[PDB]
Symmetry: D2
Subunit: 334 residues, 4 copies
């Protein structure tokens, strides 16, 4: 199985990818990173993290590398992926974390530079799009470029899968109350063409699109076209919650829904359950893609018509990263 | 000539804003007395200096037993029990009850025993007339003595639900409000009555919470009782909130039809605003509406003959709701 | 009679540039903004002008065309030039440029606006050793031959009036300042590279972040006698606007707190730039201030053992709008010289 | 003495328990006194917005908490004198309510049958301990002692190092300090202090600091020579103290840094950094104070010199580590 990884983009997701590989003592080794910033600044950002605290392992750097837990990781600085020297240290699978290569066509550049596979940390149009412990069995040995969808997709999918398997989802709409992220603005000022993205993120509730609305239908194809949604971005640094309002294929009670979800979470490393009265800071550093919260289930029933609201927490950074890593570990062995 | 002399019980966020709004609109209502647990010095400091709305627009001073606001005295009483408030001293006739401790007819009766004639409660207060101005204020009459203006979220939800119900019918619906933190919550993790989530640091968390709209809505629009449920997610913004409603309607619709219907309902409506601008919560701070419908967030999800309709309205849960309280107060005084 | 200059162009319609317009309209200035240069579309600029997270809705109407804003019914041209020398300032006869981008903070750089047809430039930031004005501290150093001028920084505009008053009353022998300062656009929203400065890379709304300010170092431009006598820095903190500067000085006289506060009170009298408070205010109370600086008598502290004395004085400032009111007073006088 | 009681299971009290378990202390917490139900206390112990999930099991009964399998009695007395500390034999009381910050007030716990009291705050004229500055002042006859305040625990090691190396002639400090429970969530009455009434997460708020009164008890040669205050700001925990001093010697920055570095060597209470840290990096710190050499500043004109030195502190967990050090020593005297 492939054991050598390269990371393109050592931002929030890239840095956490490394952290989680080390934490689970993966046999995968990160051999190289591509990013335009100096090793000294990357080392600083690896070592000190506003959301997750001090890095658990030693961190140092040289002019062209980081040294992490005594191991050397090359730092390349190519603006175009086609130029990254992935062959130099034998980088086989690229975790593409920049946001600038979110298509098969764009990520082909890494294969052209000598890698064997690419795992894209975002939705990436019409390609295999995997939420681990939902549809990771769709992968096979011939796949070369795959997506792990988005954080919100990894929250929504397991919950949608459980409801669909138990009851049928006829139609549904989701809203994620979502921690602010780097695509937003610190102060009011231009942020590309999206007006709301221009607004001070830590001072506002901000409506925003969600990657789940396009990606969910690739993950659970029976639900393609049956689900829409969006986000409200709010001033918490990480930790998010997805609410899904569905019409189901049969009549249910709150207990029945909660039981079905509890069953779906049993011995499921990707999908957790809680009936504790938690809040978002309790999900920070979670090792699930999604934690269903039985305390927030609500059934609104008027005869033949019933609306079912189900709610799951997710750490949009580290939780989603644990999912990426599960998918990567499987992807490497194919 | 109306029943113009008012007393405020509870000079907190809502009480102080009551005064600010009455003065802003040059109301004929005269606030003649306040009851609160704290000194006039402290109440004057809080009235003058506001973290959400800025400097008070009028002069503020105090004496040992009064505030002096724009040169007009307001008596300050410190009675923990409302039956002991001497409302007759200055002739306070209508009491704006803003403490949270008297949210029923039986409790707010104390003000009437203490010599007031009417009470308007700034919160849901059980099975009593419960008014969202410009939704059901025509249900008030001259015999009402204790009435509620529901909650902020009810004032946000009701006009949007009334419009949809009138134009399309609502068969069933569920709401979530993404809601600014309030004084019922906690600064640091620590006990906060019986509710476990209320104990958690409010400016550092998304905190699920119950909403007053969930019981108050079938009092305001009786055709909808039993048909809506909902809750809140309390989040770290200081004021400014947004209510999402997911409904099944009585007919099939397009987003444009929905937006047009809501736009028509907002026209010449001082309580209910409309936007198709890409606003965010800070833009609703200081709003003079109870609710502002946002056409940019309308979403129809349809499969077959099944349709879910998501409609969204903003509200300033402080000042916006207070403008509604004041409209209701002004009418109640004239009855 | 030679009329004062009345037509302004704004280079950079960021926070400062937008607030420049706001303040000119609020004061019903004689000065009209006739043009703006910025690379962002009029649609987005109109959206940002109309809706402000810090100051609320714009008080006048706003609309736009593909190449203009229409503000209070008046058209303002919008150009999109990357190089200042290419801005067509002569089209609407922009005479004074308010240079708000941060990319032209020197005489050499800002003279490009003169090449582009403007007559004078006022830079909204420190700009090396050029004429540098804190209004009501050293604006009487301006004259008719000044063509490119700086208004220093917000922190300079906070520190200087307090330092001037102390220097004039008592003497400042040496001093150091710390500003506990609202976060700004030069910082980061999430932890990530922000040029070469390590602390600027850290999430601004989630941290106390030490940061430079040249305010004290270059104070000799504004108060020559204090050149080289002051140092300081900032702690950037999670408030959206509103800041406070503390100055610890060795003075040239033994003083009491009352004596310090009285001298500062006299300095703030009939002074539209420098206010005084003895109220127990907090940062949100300074948001929207029309002063450059507001001295707070409640925070004065004298620590003294024998002849050894330290004096702490503290002034609030709205690092956005308050600083902008200073920029506008400077601009109005500059226009008449 | 090994059996402890906690009066007040707020931020400090819960973290006292957390740290005691973390260091595998032989101290045994046998009882807690707080007006809140065990249900709610167990929920707050389990789930912490600043430090994350509690690392041990937590359960409860109507009158107890069960922590890592061990029962801790929970009493609900509003007056300390009525707390029945003799029932489980609580000998040393960690007094964390803020309502008994004097000898005369904390005497109540001795009348209630405890042997000694350690107060988590300044408490007037009593022995006031910053661990690794003056913990050698404690002896076996002391019955009521203070661990000063978080800011004092930050300031003291920095002031002792400067004073020992250079002399501090006079100084003034400002701490840029995380908001705390004594402040207000929304603008509204908060006792008599006007600034405390203001929304803490939305403002810079000038405030007193415990270090102003306590530092002279910790370092007696400096009594009357230091003053200061706080600016409370919107971070949940993590703070930073700046001290501006007139020293008794002329110095360079490197000389100051070096002197500080030496003071932090083999010193479990006082850390050192030359990295470009920010406040979130101090959250969870196991020091009372971390001196930051990157912020050192020397301002000199002629033969006048001002020296600015800066130290980080986790005002919650760091200070609690110092409290625990002092408690462990106090229990053995
Ligand atoms: N977002 C909002 O704040 C909001 C919006 C709509 C309605 N409300 C509702 O209106 C009421 C007040 O809310 P608030 O946010 O102003 O609370 P607040 O806590 O800011 O104010 C409560 C005030 O009442 C005073 N008080 C408490 N008990 C009292 C008593 N027994 N006698 C006299 N004074 C007393 C307090 O000192 C404080 O000044 C509540 O019923 C609340 O549900 C609040
Ligand atoms: C998580 O991937 C990131 O915060 C994007 O959020 P989505 O809501 O999944 O688009
Ligand atoms: C408004 O009344 C106050 O914030 C309460 O909020 P609800 O969601 O209306 O209870
Ligand atoms: C104000 O100009 C801006 O926030 C910069 O702050 P300084 O502290 O003046 O550099
Ligand atoms: C720490 O003890 C608490 O936050 C008090 O702060 P001080 O600045 O030490 O009073």
């Amino acid at each position: 199985s492939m054991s050598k990884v390269g990371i393109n983009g050592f931002g929030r997701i890239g840095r956490l990818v490394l952290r989680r590989l080390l934490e689970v003592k993966s046999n995968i080794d990160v051999v190289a990173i591509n990013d335009l910033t100096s090793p000294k600044i990357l080392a600083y950002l690896l070592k000190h993290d506003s959301n997750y605290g001090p890095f658990p392992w030693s961190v140092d750097f040289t002019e062209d590398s980081l040294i992490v837990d005594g191991k050397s990781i090359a730092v390349y600085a190519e603006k175009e992926a086609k130029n990254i020297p992935w062959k130099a240290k034998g980088a086989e699978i690229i975790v593409e974390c920049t946001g600038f290569y979110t298509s098969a066509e764009k990520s082909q550049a890494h294969l052209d530079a000598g890698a064997k596979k690419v795992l894209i940390s975002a939705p990436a149009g019409e390609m295999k799009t995997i939420v681990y412990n939902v549809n990771d069995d769709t992968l096979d040995g011939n796949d070369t470029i795959v997506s792990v969808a988005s954080c919100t997709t990894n929250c929504l999918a397991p919950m949608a899968k459980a409801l669909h398997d138990s009851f049928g989802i006829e139609v549904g709409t989701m809203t994620t109350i979502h921690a602010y992220t780097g695509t937003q603005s610190l102060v009011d000022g231009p942020r590309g063409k999206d007006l709301r993205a221009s607004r001070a993120a830590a001072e506002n509730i901000i409506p925003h699109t969600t990657g789940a609305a396009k990606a969910i239908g690739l993950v659970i194809p029976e639900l393609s076209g049956k689900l829409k949604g969006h986000a409200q971005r709010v001033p918490v640094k990480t930790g998010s919650v997805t609410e899904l309002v569905s019409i189901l294929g049969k009549k249910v009670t709150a207990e029945e829904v909660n039981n079905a979800l509890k069953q779906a979470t049993t011995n499921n490393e990707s999908f957790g359950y809680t009936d504790e009265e938690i809040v978002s800071s309790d999900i920070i550093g979670s090792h699930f893609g999604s934690v269903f919260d039985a305390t927030q289930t609500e059934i609104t029933a008027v005869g033949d018509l019933q609306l079912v609201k189900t709610v799951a927490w997710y750490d949009n950074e580290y939780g989603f990263v644990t999912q990426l890593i599960r998918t990567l570990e499987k992807f490497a062995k194919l």
